C-alpha cells in the first residue's frame, strides 16, 4: 500500500511537471504538398511474406527476410541477387545489416540471433555465431558494430551481446510486455525499444538501465525508429496510430492518425531530412506523412497484402518496401 | 557491358536458379500450427506421430503419402500469443488440442478457440481440433462424480445429436457428454465467417495411432473446399 501510494504520487508529480511545461496553430511552416512516389524497381524472388528488410550502408545493397526461411542480399541498382542465405529456422522476424557491410544478423521465433559473415569468398556464406540467451521470440536485432548486437525479444527483455565470445554483455529488463522493435540512435550509444504494452523505453548500452519511459498509446507497439537526430523517435502502434516522442520534452508532440485508417501500423521509417514519416499499414498500402505539419502527404499503393517492411536508404535515394505479397518494391520521387 | 557486371549477372542467374529450385519444394510442403494448453497433450500428440520421419519453436517434419507436412509446435515462449501467431497467416491448418476432461478450465479452452477463430490473419485458416484424452472423459463420467451440469447449465437440456456415431459397446451418457463438448466448439466455429474456414473436430486419446492421417485428410478437405469455392462450384 505504501509502495503503491509512493508510485502513484510519483506518477502524479511527473504528470503535473510534464503538463506544466506544455507551451499548434503555426502557419509559418509551409506544407510539403502531395508526395509523388513511383515504383522504380520491384524486387521478386522471395517465396512467402517479406517480414523483415534492412538497408545497406552503401545505399545500394539491402538485406530482406522472408518466412520461406530466406535472407536475400539484393543489389537495388541492377536488381541482381547478390546473396541468398537459407536460414536454419523459417520464422525469421527481423534482419540486420552490419554498418561495415561485413555481417548480416537474423532472428525469429527460435529465440536466437544468427550471424553470417558476408565477406569470406572461400565457399559461400556461413554462420559465424548463434547468439542464444533469449527466452522469447526476437523482434529486432541491430548491429552497434562488427562485434556488438542489440536484440529485442518476446521475453520482455532487450540484450546487448558480444558476437566474439558468444554470451550476453548487458540485459535490459524494464518492459512488462513483449518488445517488438528497437532503434539505435545516430550516436550509436543508446537504443529505444517499444513493447506490446503501450510503452517505449530508452536504454544506455554502457550502464543498462532505463533513462526515460514513454506512454500515450492504447495498444501494442509494432514498430519504432529514430528521428535522424538522436532527439526523437516515432512509434507505430496497433491501435491505428503513430506517435512522436521527444526526449528533451519527455512527453508527446505529434500523433498521426485518420478517421479513415482503422488498421494498425506495421512499420515506421524516416526519410533523410526527417520530414517524411513512412509507415506501412495493415490495409495493404504504405502511407507517407508530413512530420512537421501533421497531415497526409501521400500513399504507396501497389502491394496486394499487408506491408511489413519499410526502409529508407542512408543517402535517402530509395525507399524499399516489403509486404506479405512476397515482393519488395523500390520507390522514388519523379 | 563489363566483366564485373558479367560475373554479377552470372551469379544472380545462379541464385535465381536456386530460388526456383527452392520454390518448387516450398510450395509442395504444408505448414501446420500446433496449439494447445499445458494439460492438453500436445507433447504426446507430437511424440506419437514422430515415427513419420531455450529454443523458441520446435519443428516436426512428417510425411503422409509424400505430401511432407511441417508442423511447428511452439515451446519456450511467453504466455501471451497475440503477436507471434500472425506468422501463421498462411498455414494450411491450425491443429488445436484440447483437454476436455477437466470441466474447470474447459471454459478458457473455449475462449481460446473462439479467439483463434475470430482473429484476422486467421479468418481463412481452418482449425483442426483434437479433443484429447477421451479415456479420461469416459472414466470421469463413468465414476459419476463432477457432473458437467455443475459447470455447464445447458447440458441438462441437451440431447445426443442425430448425426452422432458412437462406437459400439459405449455408454450413452459418455457419448452424450462427448458430443456436447464437441458441439460447444462446433457452435463457436459455425458462427463466424462465411465459408472461408471450417472446424474439423476429432476425438483422440493419448495412445491413439492414425492421428497423422487426420491432419492429412482434413488438409485435403481444406484445399478442396477452397478450390471448389473459388471455382464458384460451392
Amino acid at each position, epitope marked *: 500500500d505504501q509502495l503503491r501510494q509512493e508510485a502513484e504520487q510519483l506518477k502524479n508529480q511527473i504528470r503535473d511537471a510534464r503538463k506544466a511545461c506544455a507551451d499548434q496553430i503555426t502557419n509559418n511552416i509551409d506544407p510539403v504538398g502531395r508526395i509523388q512516389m513511383r515504383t522504380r524497381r520491384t524486387l521478386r524472388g522471395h517465396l512467402a511474406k517479406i517480414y523483415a528488410m534492412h538497408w545497406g550502408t552503401d545505399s545500394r545493397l539491402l538485406v530482406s527476410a522472408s518466412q520461406d526461411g530466406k535472407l536475400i542480399i539484393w543489389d537495388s541498382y541492377t536488381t541482381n541477387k547478390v546473396h541468398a542465405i537459407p536460414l536454419r529456422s523459417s520464422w525469421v522476424m527481423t534482419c540486420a545489416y552490419a554498418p561495415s557491410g561485413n555481417y548480416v544478423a537474423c532472428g525469429g521465433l527460435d529465440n536466437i540471433c544468427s550471424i553470417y559473415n558476408l565477406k569470406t569468398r572461400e565457399g559461400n556464406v556461413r554462420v559465424s555465431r548463434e547468439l542464444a540467451g533469449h527466452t522469447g521470440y526476437l523482434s529486432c536485432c541491430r548491429f552497434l558494430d562488427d562485434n556488438q548486437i542489440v536484440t529485442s525479444s518476446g521475453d520482455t527483455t532487450c540484450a546487448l551481446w558480444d558476437i566474439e565470445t558468444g554470451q550476453q554483455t548487458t540485459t535490459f529488463t524494464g518492459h*512488462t*510486455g513483449d518488445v517488438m522493435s528497437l532503434s539505435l540512435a545516430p550516436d550509436t550509444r543508446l537504443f529505444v525499444s517499444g*513493447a*506490446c*504494452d*503501450a510503452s517505449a523505453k530508452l536504454w544506455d548500452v554502457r550502464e543498462g538501465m532505463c533513462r526515460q519511459t514513454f*506512454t500515450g498509446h*492504447e*495498444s*501494442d507497439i509494432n514498430a519504432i525508429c529514430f528521428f535522424p537526430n538522436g532527439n526523437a523517435f516515432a512509434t507505430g502502434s*496497433d*491501435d*491505428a496510430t503513430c506517435r512522436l516522442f521527444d526526449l528533451r520534452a519527455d512527453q508527446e508532440l505529434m500523433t498521426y492518425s485518420h478517421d479513415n485508417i*482503422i488498421c*494498425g501500423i506495421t512499420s515506421v521509417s524516416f526519410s533523410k531530412s526527417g520530414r517524411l514519416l513512412l509507415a506501412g499499414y495493415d490495409d495493404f498500402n504504405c502511407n507517407v506523412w508530413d512530420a512537421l505539419k501533421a497531415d497526409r502527404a501521400g500513399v504507396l499503393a501497389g502491394h496486394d497484402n499487408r506491408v511489413s517492411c519499410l526502409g529508407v536508404t542512408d543517402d535517402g535515394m530509395a525507399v524499399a518496401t516489403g509486404s506479405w505479397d512476397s515482393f519488395l518494391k523500390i520507390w522514388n520521387g519523379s | 557491358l563489363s566483366a564485373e557486371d558479367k560475373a554479377a549477372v552470372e551469379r544472380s542467374k545462379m541464385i535465381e536458379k536456386q530460388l526456383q529450385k527452392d520454390k518448387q519444394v516450398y510450395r509442395a510442403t504444408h505448414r501446420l500450427l500446433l496449439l494447445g494448453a499445458d494439460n492438453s497433450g500436445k507433447s504426446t500428440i507430437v511424440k506419437q506421430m514422430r515415427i513419420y520421419h531455450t529454443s523458441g519453436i520446435f519443428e516436426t517434419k512428417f510425411q503422409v503419402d509424400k505430401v511432407n507436412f511441417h508442423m511447428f509446435d511452439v515451446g519456450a515462449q511467453r*504466455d*501471451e*500469443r*497475440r503477436k507471434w501467431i500472425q506468422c501463421f497467416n498462411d498455414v494450411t491448418a491450425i491443429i488445436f488440442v484440447v483437454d476436455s476432461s477437466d470441466y*474447470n*478450465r474447459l*471454459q*478458457e479452452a473455449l*475462449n481460446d478457440f*473462439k*479467439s*483463434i*477463430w*475470430n*482473429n*484476422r490473419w486467421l479468418r481463412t485458416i481452418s482449425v483442426i481440433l483434437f479433443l484429447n484424452k477421451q479415456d479420461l472423459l469416459a472414466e470421469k463420467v463413468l465414476a459419476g462424480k463432477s457432473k458437467i451440469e*455443475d*459447470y*455447464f*447449465p*445447458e447440458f441438462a437440456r441437451y440431447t445426443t445429436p442425430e448425426d452422432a456415431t458412437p462406437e459400439p459397446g459405449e455408454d450413452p451418457r459418455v457419448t452424450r457428454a462427448k458430443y456436447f463438448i464437441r458441439d460447444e466448439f462446433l457452435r463457436i466455429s459455425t458462427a*463466424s465467417g462465411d465459408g472461408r474456414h471450417y472446424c474439423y473436430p476429432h476425438f483422440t486419446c493419448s495412445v491413439d495411432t492414425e492421428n497423422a492421417r487426420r491432419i492429412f485428410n482434413d488438409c485435403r478437405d481444406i484445399i478442396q473446399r477452397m478450390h471448389l469455392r473459388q471455382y464458384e462450384l460451392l
Partner: nanobody
Amino acid sequence: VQLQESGGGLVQPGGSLRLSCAASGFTFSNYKMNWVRQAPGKGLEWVSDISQSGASISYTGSVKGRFTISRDNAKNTLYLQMNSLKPEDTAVYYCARCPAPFTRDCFDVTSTTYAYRGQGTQVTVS
C-alpha cells in the same frame, strides 16, 4: 492506460454487489471487455464478456443467468451486478480490456501477466 476496479468486500452468501471498472487513456467504446477472476490456489479464469456496444454478452457456464454485465461508454465505466452468491465466488475480480480495437477476439486476458489489467477487487463469501 490504467483500469481501476471499484467495489469489493465480504458479503454473506446470497448477497448483492456492484463492481464498477473505470478506464482511462483510450476510447472505451471501441474495445471488447471482460471480467476475469482469480480464486486462491488457482489461476485466472475468464468469467464475463461484453462486446463494443453491448451487442453481445457472454458468461462462463457456472455464471450464466446469475450475474450481469453492462457498459457505460458515455460514463466510460463498465458495470457488473452481482447477486445470488456462492462459496466458490471468493476471489479477486479483474476488468480486462483486450489488445486491439475493432476486433471480435481478445487474446491473453487469462494470461499470467497482461499489458494493462486492473489491480483487482477482492470479493469474499461467508
